[PDB]
C-alpha cells in the first residue's frame, strides 16, 4: 500500500535537508525526526502536533517560507536552531497531508496565511487525527532513518 | 401532557398547599429519600411578598424563591395567577440535581403582576424557628408524596434541609 | 461413494503455532510457517493427521487399532486408511483495530479475505453432497459473503471505518444490513479485499528473532540469531476429515471425535507453540 | 484522550477573538505559560485567587464573560492585564461548564449579581484536587495553542 | 494425563523488566518490548526457557541432569525436552490512581482487561484438559469477572470513580464484595474495558531515553541517544509450566519449582531490569 | 548465592540533584526529573551506573580492569557486565514543617511514605535470595513500620501533629516504642499514607525557572526562558549494587565499594548539583 | 436420585408421547433455547422398529438412533420394557453440548428383548417428511415444551432442524 | 522438640482417625481460614495400601501422598508402624504455604513394610467422591478441627478444596 511513502519520504527530505543552511539546524532535525515520531503513537497525533506548533513559532516570513518549500527550492528556513528544526518538522507532516490528499492543497495554504482560518486546520486535523496517524506511520518512520543517516556530525 | 405546578418554602401559611390536588401519577421532579431533598427548584428574579407566596417579577438576579415545583394544576379555579409556562426542562435551575429529567414540562408558578404601588425593596428571607420548621414539613412535606411521616426515619434530614436548603426574599410591603 | 460421510471443523489456535516448512519461502524468515499456493498460513494434510495421530495414541492408548484403521496403521501393516484430512485452510486471523467510536467498541477483530472465503466455500460445496447433515446454514453465509465481493465487509459489526494492524485504514459496509456471525466469539468478522486484506494478514503474522546466548559470557553466539515465523492465537483454521464407510469409523466419529477438543500441531512445544483447539462444525451451527 | 484537545480549541478560538487589541493578545501569551506552571507549582486554589484577582471582574467584566459563554462576538474590555486574566478566567470556567464540573446555570447566576460568586469560590474550593487532576491537559494546551497563535512581544 | 504435571504461575516484576525486540515490525521504539498479538506487553516462553534454564543451572548445579531432561540439553540434543513453558499473558498492570472519593484513598492500583482475562482462561481450559489438574478456583473467580464483561469493576475496593495514569475517568461497578482477591495484595484490582483499558495500560510502560555520553566532553555521542521500553514494577504476568512423565518431571515439580521464587528473565540486566518473582498457582489460593 | 555481593546503600543528596528524563509533550515542565512507576521521583539505574562508573575510571586509574570487568568495558565489549545496579528508589524527601502541637521546635523533616518502603521490602527480600547476604537489621525496621500501615507514624519523635510543606496536616502517632534512626540524624522521619504523601512529596520538589541573557545588550533571549525541576538537597534515595563472583567482585567490594563517598549525579553540574554520598547499608547501623 | 428418561425422535407411531410424565419440577437436560435443539442424546448400537417403538440393541457400532431426554419415569403401564441405568455425566453421546451435567444420571430407555424370530437388518432412516414434523412438534415440543407454541419460537430454524438433525437407523420390517 | 503427626486424606475405610491424640498444646501446621487449606503436606517416593492405609516406600518419584499435618503424638500406643523423622522446616515439601515453621519439626507418618511379597503397582487415584468427601469432612477434619463446623461457615469452602488438593497414589490391592 505504502510503497510510495518511501518515495515522498526522499522528496520532502531533500527539500528539508537543504532549507536547513545552518549546521546546527540539520543535527537540531535529526533531534526531531527521532523524538516526534515516537511522540505520535504514544501521546497521539494532535498532542504532539499542538507541541509542534508550540515549538515551530510561527506568524513570520518563516510561515510563508513553508508555503514557498511547498513548489520551490530555494527556499530556506531562518530563525532559532530550535524553531527551524521543529518548523521544518512542521512541513514534513504538512508535505505529506498535501501529497496524499488528506487535506486540500489550497485549503493548507490559504490558511497558512490567513491568521483566522489557522484555527479552522488545527480543527480540520483534530477530525483526521485517527486517518492521519495510520497513514503517516511509514512516512515519518522513513524520515526517522533517513535523518539518522544523512544527518550527520561533522 | 406532564402538568406540573410551583410550591415553595417560605415562613408563610398562605403556601400550606395552595393549589389543589397532585397530578393522581406517580411522577414528580424532586427526590427525598437518601440525601434529603433532592432537585430543589431556585427561580431568580422573584419574591415572595411575606404572605400570599405568589412571586412578583423584579429585575436583579440576586432574588430568589428555593421550592419544590411538583406534579398539579393551580387550585382546579381561576387561573387569573399563575404563569401557566412550558419548557423542555433544560432551561429551569435546579440545585442539587438527580435523575436526569428528558421531557418538556408545562409548569405553573404563583405569579403576581409588578405591583407598581410603591418600590420594592427585597429583604432576604432565611429560614429558622424550628417549630414551623415542623410545621412546614406537616403542612406542605407530608402531603405531597405521604411517604414522608409515615415511614421515614429521615424526618430527621427534611427538618434540616429547610433550613440548610431554602433561603429567599420578601418585599414585607 | 466411499466417503460415507466428511465432519468439518475449526482449528483455533490457543497459543501461537508453529507449523514449520523448512526455508521454502524468502521474506527474511529462516524457518517460515506451512504456506499454501497463494501465500497464506496453512497446515498440510499431512502434518495434521500426523499430530492428530501422534495425540490421540497416546490419550486413547487403548483403542489404537480403531486409530490405525482409520489413520492409517504406521507400522509395514499397509491396509488402505479409512479417513483423510484435507488442509487446514486460513480461514480468520486476529487483527488490532481502532475504530472511530464508530461502535460498542473493540480492540481486536477478525480478519479474512475474499480469496480465503472462496476455498473455504470449495471445501463447503464439496462435502454437501454426502453430508445429509447439511451445514447450509453456514455454507449460505459464505455464498451471501461472496456475492457482496470488492468491496471490505463487516458482517455483524456496525463500524464504518476502523484502523487494522495500525496501518491500514478500510472503510467497512455491512452485508446487506445484518447476519449471524460464524465464530460464536463476540468479535466481529470483517473481510478485506485480496490486496488490502493480504497486507492487513501479513501484519497479523508474528516473525521474531531468536538468539542463542553464550552462557558464560550471556552474549549472543556467532550466527546464533535466527528469524522465526508463528501464527497468533486465537487464529481459525478450517478443514474437513472426510472417512470411508466403515464400522471403524463409526466408533472413531463417534467415541474418538467427541472427546478431542484440544490438540498440539506443529512444533517448538517447549515454547508453548502447539496448542490448538478442534470445534467440529456439526454443533457450533 | 483528546476531547480536551477540542474544548481547548473552542475556548481559544474565543478567546482569540474577544482579544482585540494584539498588545491584549501578548499578555495572554504570557498568562498561558505562567499560569499553568503555577498551577503545578502552588496549586489550584492559590492560582485561582491570583488569577481572579488580577482579573478585576466587576460586573461590566461578569457581562462580557457570561456573554461570551453564548455569543461570538463579545469582547473583552480593560488594559492587557485585566483582560489577559479575565481572558484565562474564561477559559478555565470554560472548561468547568463543558466538563460538568458546575452547572452552568449556577455558574452564571454565580457570576452575576453580588454574593454567590463567595459561593461560587466556596464550591471550587471544595472541588479543587477534582479540577487540578483533570485541566491539567487542557490548560496545557492552551499553553502550546497560545505560543503558537500568538506573536510574541 | 498428556500432561505429567502442569504448573500455572505469576510472574510479579521487582525491578522494571524488559524483555528485548524480538519482531520484525520497524517501531518507533528503538528497543521497544515483547508485544502480545493484542499489543499487549508479553514474554514470549522461548525468553521464559532460556533465562529460567540458565538460572536453574546454576542454582541447582547437582541436578544438572534433571533440568537437561525438562528443559532440554544445550550443545548436542539426543531428545526432545520434556517441560513446555507457555508465553506470559499479561495479567495485571500497575497505574497511578487519583480516587475521586471513598473511605480509603489510593496512589495506584492493578489494571487489568476483558481481553486479557479471556486469555488467561483459555490457558487454563485447555491446560486443564491436557492434564489431570483441575484450577478451578481461579476459573471460578475469572469466570464471574468475565460474565459482567463490557463494565468497568473495581474487585472488591468501593471506588465508583477515579482518574487513572493522570488522563482518563471512569466509573467502577462493585462485583460481589465477597470474592477474594486473584493475587494477595490489598491494592485492589479494576478489570477495564478493553478499549479503555488498552490506552490506559500504554501509560503505564516506560519509555525510556537513554544516552552515551563521551568520556572526553561529558556530552552525547555522535547519534549516541536511543530510546527504551520498560514494563513497570509490581506488573503481573501469567504463565504456565507444564511437562511429560519422566522420573525427572517428579523430581522438577519437587525440589526445582518448589525452591524457585526469584528469576532474572530479560535484558537490561546491568542496569537491574530484571529481577521478577514467580508465584505458584498452587500457593496463592 | 546468584550474586557474590549484595551491597545495599543510601544516596545522600549534597546539594540539589537533577537527573533529566528529557523534555516531553505531556510534562509542562521544560526539563523534569526522572520520574517512578507512580509518580515519586527516582534515578534510573542506567543514570546510577553510568555516572559512578565514569567516577571510579579517573578515581582509581589503576583498577581500570577491575572495574571494566564489573562495569562493563566501553570500546569492544566482548561480555557482559558483572556488577548490577538497581533503580534508586526515593527513600525520604526533605519536607518543611509546622511543629504545632509541641514545643520542641524543628524546621525540615524527613517524610516517607508506606508504598515508597514498600519498594524497599521488596529490593530486601529479593536480594536476600540472589546472595547469601541477609539485611535483618534492616529488614525488620521496614517491616516493624509497615505493620503500622494504614495511619501516619513519626519514628524518633513527639509531634503528634504538623503541618507539612505550607498546606498538608497530618495527625502523626509516634511509633510503638522506637526504632533506633534508619537514617541517623536528629531530624526526625515521618512517614505518610500515600495519598497524604503523593502530595507532600511533589510540594517538596524544587521547580526553578532560568533565563538565557543577550551577550552584548543585557536582555533575555528570544524563548531563552526554561524551567527545571531539582530533588532538596539531603534527599535519599535508596540502591543496591549486586555482583556475580570474578575474581573482579571481590576486589570491587573490598577496594572500590570502600572509597566510595562522594560521587556526581545526574546534570547541571555547573550550577553545583548532582553532588552526592553513596552511604553504604553494610556500615549504616 | 434424579429421574430421567429418553424419547427418541422417529417418523413412527407409538411415540407420540411414551414418557406418560413431564419435569414435575424444572429440571432437564434437553433444550430448546432460541438457537435449536441443545444436548441431544445419541445411541449407538441400538435400532427402532417401527412396531410399537423402541430401541433393539443391535450389536453393530455403524447403527444409531437419535433423541431427546426428558425428565421423568417410564409410561407406567408396562414398566418392564425400559433398561434403567445410573451413569455420570461425561459418559453420554450428547449432541450440540450447551452446558455441564448433573454428574448423576438415571435414565430410562424404550426396550425390547431382541426378538430374534427375524434377522435383524436396519436402514438409514432421515424423519423430513414434512408433513410429519408438525404432528410430533404437536405430540412432544409441545406437551413437554408449552413455550414453543408460545410468545416466542423460530419457525425457520426449529420447524425445520428435526427434519435436519434427528436420524436413526430403522429395522424397515 | 514438636510432636506433629502426618495424616493422609485418602478415600479409604480406616482412614478415620487411626490416632487417639489431638492438638494437646496450641500449634498446628494446616489450617482452614475462609481461603482453604494451607501447608498441606506432600511426601514423594511413597504410595499409600489403601488395605490398612499407610504409606509403602516405593523408590517412584512419581508416586506421592497428599496429607495434613496435625499437631499430637503419634497415638502413644502402636509407636512401630509409625516412621518417626526430625526434620527442618525448609525440608518439608508443603503446598499452599502460608507462614513458615519452627525450622525443627519431629513427623510421625504412617509407615508400613515395603511387603517385597507382590511387585509394585501404583494408580493415580483423585479424592473427588462426593460420597466420601462428606465422611471424611465429618470424619478426618472436624475431629480435627471443630473449628470448622463452629465459626468458620466456610464449610463448602473446605470441601471445595479437598476435591482438589489431595491427589494420593494407591497400590489399589
Known amino acids: ?154 | 401532557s406532564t402538568q406540573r405546578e410551583y410550591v415553595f418554602i417560605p415562613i408563610t401559611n398562605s403556601i400550606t398547599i395552595d393549589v389543589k390536588i397532585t397530578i393522581g401519577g406517580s411522577d414528580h421532579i424532586t427526590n427525598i429519600d437518601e440525601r434529603g431533598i433532592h432537585n430543589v427548584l431556585v427561580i431568580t428574579g422573584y419574591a415572595v411578598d411575606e404572605k400570599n407566596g405568589r412571586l412578583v417579577p423584579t429585575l436583579d438576579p440576586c432574588d430568589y424563591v428555593k421550592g419544590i415545583l411538583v406534579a398539579g394544576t393551580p387550585q382546579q379555579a381561576q387561573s387569573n395567577d399563575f404563569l401557566t409556562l412550558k419548557l423542555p426542562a433544560n432551561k429551569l435551575y435546579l440545585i442539587r440535581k438527580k435523575g436526569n429529567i428528558s421531557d418538556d414540562l408545562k409548569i405553573y408558578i404563583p405569579y403576581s403582576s409588578p405591583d407598581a404601588r410603591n418600590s420594592m425593596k427585597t429583604k432576604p428571607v432565611s429560614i429558622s424557628d424550628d417549630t414551623i420548621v415542623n410545621n412546614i414539613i406537616k403542612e406542605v412535606f407530608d402531603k405531597i408524596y405521604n411517604i414522608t411521616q409515615k415511614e421515614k426515619v429521615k424526618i430527621e434530614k427534611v427538618k434540616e434541609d429547610i433550613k440548610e436548603l431554602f433561603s429567599y426574599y420578601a418585599l414585607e410591603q | 461413494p466411499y466417503y460415507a460421510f466428511a465432519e468439518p471443523f475449526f482449528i483455533h489456535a490457543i497459543t501461537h503455532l508453529h507449523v514449520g516448512s523448512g526455508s521454502s519461502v524468502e521474506e527474511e524468515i529462516d524457518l517460515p510457517f506451512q504456506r499454501d499456493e497463494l501465500g497464506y498460513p496453512t497446515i498440510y494434510a499431512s502434518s495434521l493427521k500426523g499430530a492428530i495421530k501422534s495425540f490421540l495414541l497416546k490419550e486413547f492408548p487403548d483403542k489404537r487399532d480403531v486409530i490405525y484403521k482409520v489413520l492409517g496403521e504406521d507400522e509395514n501393516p499397509e491396509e488402505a486408511s479409512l479417513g483423510t484430512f484435507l488442509d487446514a485452510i486460513l480461514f480468520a486471523i486476529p487483527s488490532r483495530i481502532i475504530e472511530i467510536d464508530s461502535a460498542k467498541p473493540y480492540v481486536w477483530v477478525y480478519v479474512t479475505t475474499y480469496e480465503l472465503l472462496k476455498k473455504v466455500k470449495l471445501y463447503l460445496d464439496s462435502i454437501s453432497q454426502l453430508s445429509n447433515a447439511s451445514f447450509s446454514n453456514l455454507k449460505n453465509k459464505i455464498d451471501t459473503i461472496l456475492a457482496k465481493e470488492g468491496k471490505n465487509i463487516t458482517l455483524d459489526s456496525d463500524l464504518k471505518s476502523a484502523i487494522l494492524n495500525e496501518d491500514f485504514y478500510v472503510e467497512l459496509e455491512a452485508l446487506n444490513n445484518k447476519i449471524p456471525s460464524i465464530i460464536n466469539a463476540g468479535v466481529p468478522l470483517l473481510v478485506l479485499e485480496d490486496s488490502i486484506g493480504r497486507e492487513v494478514i501479513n501484519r497479523s503474522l508474528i516473525r521474531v528473532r531468536r538468539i542463542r546466548i553464550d552462557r558464560d559470557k550471556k552474549v549472543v553466539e556467532t550466527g546464533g540469531l535466527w528469524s522465526e515465523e508463528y501464527v497468533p492465537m486465537k487464529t481459525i483454521f478450517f478443514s474437513v476429515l472426510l472417512g470411508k464407510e466403515s464400522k471403524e469409523s463409526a466408533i472413531f466419529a463417534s467415541c474418538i471425535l467427541r472427546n478431542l477438543r484440544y490438540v498440539i500441531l506443529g512444533g517448538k512445544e517447549t515454547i508453548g507453540k502447539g496448542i490448538v483447539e478442534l470445534r467440529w462444525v456439526k454443533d457450533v451451527i
Open chain 1, 1 to 154: 500500500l505504502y510503497e510510495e511513502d518511501y518515495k515522498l519520504a526522499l522528496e520532502a527530505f531533500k527539500k528539508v535537508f537543504n532549507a536547513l543552511t545552518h549546521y546546527g539546524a540539520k543535527q537540531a532535525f535529526r533531534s526531531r525526526a527521532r523524538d516526534l515520531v515516537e511522540e505520535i503513537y504514544n501521546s497521539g497525533f494532535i498532542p504532539t502536533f499542538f507541541y509542534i506548533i508550540s515549538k515551530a513559532e510561527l506568524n513570520s516570513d518563516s510561515l510563508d517560507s513553508l508555503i514557498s518549500l511547498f513548489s520551490s527550492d530555494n527556499a530556506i528556513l531562518r530563525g532559532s536552531d530550535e524553531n527551524v528544526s521543529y518548523s521544518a518538522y512542521l512541513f514534513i507532516i504538512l508535505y505529506y497531508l498535501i501529497k496524499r490528499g488528506i487535506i486540500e492543497q489550497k485549503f493548507l495554504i490559504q490558511a497558512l496565511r490567513c491568521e483566522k482560518t489557522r484555527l479552522d486546520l488545527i480543527d480540520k486535523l483534530y477530525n483526521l487525527a485517527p486517518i492521519i496517524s495510520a497513514k503517516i506511520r511509514t512516512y515519518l518512520l522513513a524520515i526517522k532513518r533517513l535523518s539518522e543517516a544523512l544527518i550527520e556530525a561533522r
